[model samples]
Target: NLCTQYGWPNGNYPDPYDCRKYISCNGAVATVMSCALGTVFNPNTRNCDAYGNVPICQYALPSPIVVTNICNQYGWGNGNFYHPYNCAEYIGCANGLTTVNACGAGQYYDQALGRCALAGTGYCRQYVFTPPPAPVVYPDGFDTYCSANNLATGIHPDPYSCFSYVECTFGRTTHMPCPAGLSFDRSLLVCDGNRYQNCGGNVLV
Candidate 1:
């Protein structure tokens, strides 16, 4: 018979002798019992008897075997057991095959498909620049523009005066002379010269 080819006992019934005596026989019996018992009894024992002097079964017991069977019949694998209390610590596969349907709200599991993807909303804003008038010019020799109104004026003695002009005209289009000591910064619409240096110090780049 085909069963004999795999070393199954010749008769329909297994040998009468206690299988636990022989390692091979015990293993064979355990396999058969496990199939018959489904997942109820300890798989290690293969649903066979367990007592003193009996060969020790070292495999871990499948948790809530009944529940696992239900998951299997439905086409789900060990992965379906996402209960935190039951399979939380189980990192290895059971029965050599398992799969989960969906992970908890925050938790995601699909090693084959890659762990869960982040969930949230994202936002962004575009930058806008307002240009100055074409006639705008800085002071001759001084080569610095006034911050107050965007007018061309000689370098002011106090840098603070020049700074005031830049910070004041910031995003506006106007023509104002620099104070006595400051110069013009045609490059930046915000600062007439280097006057209001302290204004943007706290802004991170």
Candidate 2:
């Protein structure tokens, strides 16, 4: 379609449906090409760019959160805070509403320092409730339970990491990290965009 439309023997064009994919035409033959995950095609530069760089492909990235969702997930406080997804992005809630923002290149939001800092020095996914001082077994003894029950295939939440889970295959357990910005849902046994609110105990599936 692009070769015919552009009247070119070879060309590249962005996909209307998927920002992460592009259409490449060679000798009037069109083929779909994919950019690496976490990157989107930039129309201006004709190259794949970071989520923050390409504004036109914003829809390909994660959805912006509302004030209620941010507050409920992080806290009830009203102020600027680091985004759950990326260190470069931040969110502010006021007037019962929320606004998302991003920092310049080579910078990351530091929640511990309460300010933006150099990329390498800033805390990315680290949070107060995570990363205990001592090494702690994740899933809180789920490995032993899985071995006893003989769960051939099962998914369990990782208590140490919010966006990770443990998978049991024939009583063997493996750590699995969920996609960025998603949290492991114990109730549904899948990665979920919304944080699992009820995490006190195992929800019998």
Candidate 3:
């Protein structure tokens, strides 16, 4: 019964240290160890963490608490749900009891559906959701230039310039630098330090 001496008596519990052995206290015979199937054994509490809600037996050393069950009050045992209830509203439990609840101010809940939802006629399903705008791979920095096609004018700058300038007209690409140390400035019609603004920051994805 050494296991239960601290707070419990000789109870059957799995050993955190060993997956095979557990303590079995039979009243008068308080300190008997029996082989087990990996569960905590507390003599005083006379409980094992074999079920979802029971705490571990005092006989075993403390380990991470593994919430043994995924089921809830209504029912459990597979063919069930990962959550306690269907959504739209939140759920709460206390005093060994449970209660159904509604969603917040502008929300809704459906038991059969088991989930929270937005308000309106669509009520639960009527929330407006605007998808995010696509990412601008080419932010304000990368150099740009020219008529998309043989079209004409308001050219975006040219592609960035690491080594040489790659200019495309109609279809062909000319990979030659504009000038010695300069480039065609989108502003003054020319190109160097800040002069070659064409070749600066790296483009983001």
Model 2: number of clashes?
0
lDDT computed for candidate 1: 0.27
Better of 1 and 2 by lDDT: 2
lDDT of 1 by residue, 79-191 (tens): 32221112111122256353334444643332222333233221000000111222345554332334443543332222333333332233333334442112234344432
* Candidate 3 local lDDT, 1-205, one digit each (tens): 3333322233343333332244454562544454345554321122343422333222254533222221243222222111111124333334324343556665555322445545434221111111112221333422333323442332333444422344555644344444222333454433321221333311100
lDDT tens per residue, model 2, 1-205:
5445333334455554566776676677778888787777643334566766554355434632222354444332456655643446666656436566777787766654546677552134221122112334556665575576665677876656655787887778777665433456567777643332322111211
* Cα distance off (Å), candidate 3, residue 83: 71
| Model 2 alpha-carbon drift over 4 Å, by segment | 1-69, 72-75, 125-205
Error of 3 at 30 (Å): 80
Model 3's TM-score against the true structure: 0.18
Clashes of 3: 32
